[PDB]
Design a protein around this nucleic acid. Sequence first.
DNA 1: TGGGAATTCCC
DNA 2: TGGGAATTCCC
Lengths: 312, 312
Amino acid sequence: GPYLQILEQPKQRGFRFRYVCEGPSHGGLPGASSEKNKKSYPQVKICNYVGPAKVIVQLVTNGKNIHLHAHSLVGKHCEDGVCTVTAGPKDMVVGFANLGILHVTKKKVFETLEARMTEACIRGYNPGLLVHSDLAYLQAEGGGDRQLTDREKEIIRQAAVQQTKEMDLSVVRLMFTAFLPDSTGSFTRRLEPVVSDAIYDSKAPNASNLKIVRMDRTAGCVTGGEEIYLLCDKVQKDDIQIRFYEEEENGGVWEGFGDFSPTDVHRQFAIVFKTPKYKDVNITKPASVFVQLRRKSDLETSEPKPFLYYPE
Amino acid sequence: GPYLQILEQPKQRGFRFRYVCEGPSHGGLPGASSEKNKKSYPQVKICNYVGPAKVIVQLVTNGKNIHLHAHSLVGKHCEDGVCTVTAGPKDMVVGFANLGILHVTKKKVFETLEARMTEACIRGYNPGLLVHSDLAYLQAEGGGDRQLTDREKEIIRQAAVQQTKEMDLSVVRLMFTAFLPDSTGSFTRRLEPVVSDAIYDSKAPNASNLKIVRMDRTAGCVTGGEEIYLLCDKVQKDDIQIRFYEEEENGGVWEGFGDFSPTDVHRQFAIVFKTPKYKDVNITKPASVFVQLRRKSDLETSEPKPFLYYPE
DNA sequence: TGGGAATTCCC
DNA sequence: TGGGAATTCCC
């Protein structure tokens, strides 16, 4: 049966949600495989054609049951947190370049959410899926839906009250929904919507871009127990660790860990630790390895810093 | 003639304003001489007598034109950010040993201020002074109040906007005003206002308590210029210096400053610098000194740390 | 408490 | 497609 598929997925880490105050984002949500040598943006295609359609993107949460998020996708074909673009006659590939994510404050959550659920329900933007398991019975587009009843508005309120409590403002997903032409003109054949993978705010303490900016000693004697002051960018004391390693590739490469306690991490921007023992014992010659910060929650890592062990 | 006279001034530095979210300050705004277990708090006296008296404590603006501040003094005998005390029948010297300072949010500064001007007009608590000359008349012959009129609300809402733009949310000053009696229970024979000293918020980035936490190298060569990694509590890169000094007799003997630029202060919690040389090199025997941080602005400092220069 | 960190804003 | 700090809030 005809369908919607994501070609270019959105990249999970590295992009920052912006608050209204910050100004626009410089670029937009990037694609999973982007890099400076050659950048990229999220992309989807409607398989099995099924007539020139329209595609809507929306921000949903990262939970057991995907509901509406209170942050908003901002961009050219975007309005009220919902983006809407058309699938031209011949080309069924839709790309999403310059997509910003707008970050709401905890104050304006319930507020924004209630409106999103209101507009979703009247505009047929998947009310049973995202809003409440029992509502706005049916989808479609601009022909077969309109003004709400008290019971509904009421259901919409209890939903926003609860869901405001269970929303993470650090993680977000993209939901794409396509509409094939019903009757004549009126797009309304909604193909099953598909949710992208999680996108985490790089300004979130646990999804931050890890970095070693400078360390007092960049070489140490084989053994290790030499105290080193390392200055980094914001890290979480009970989740960070210093990883010394040697990329021998063909086999089990080397790996050791700087020694310290959570109390040694000074105000999130520095760690005073003690070097670990090189290749168990050692004698060698000056053996080069790398140092890096790594999060034990998600094993995400910082750019490497070259270290150098020297015999005794 | 009768005079209001601040005996004991407030603790000008070291007190933390608390958001309504945070509760009490445990103690009470202490005075300029409050030593642990020898507690002394702000004090005033009305000289030349006046009889039973009433005294209001209201928070005002540290600025080229003292106005009503947006924050609020909270405590017993304190209501709506205005405290009132009945200068005893014979005593005449009053003290407030439990004043707390409630920090408003940059968001709620207009509403709170506007209301403060309103309740200050409808009660004669220095309107033509704190608010706008135009509302000086406010006291007239009202039975302990007023019912605001035409421009007598407009100019208020007006002033609240221009003043909210001015406001420094880190500093406050107290204004004590004594109220003398007459025919019937009046207590409306004012006395010129007395404004205490500037009270700076401890949680203010530029009034916090300076402190050296750990050091890279605690001793050096008399021919300083050696690099140290210093972990400190919050400082500001453009207003910080590190001083190496020592005990001696009369006369400016030794005082040296660490070598670095603002770019070397790392995320406000660490500084990377070069040590200064002694007033020599040509000496024998290690000479102990002290290192201390200090704000270039006001010259506030931290508890010093030992340093030892070596010969060869 | 107040020592610290999460959240928001500013160029 | 940053860099760096100031503001509130927790417990």
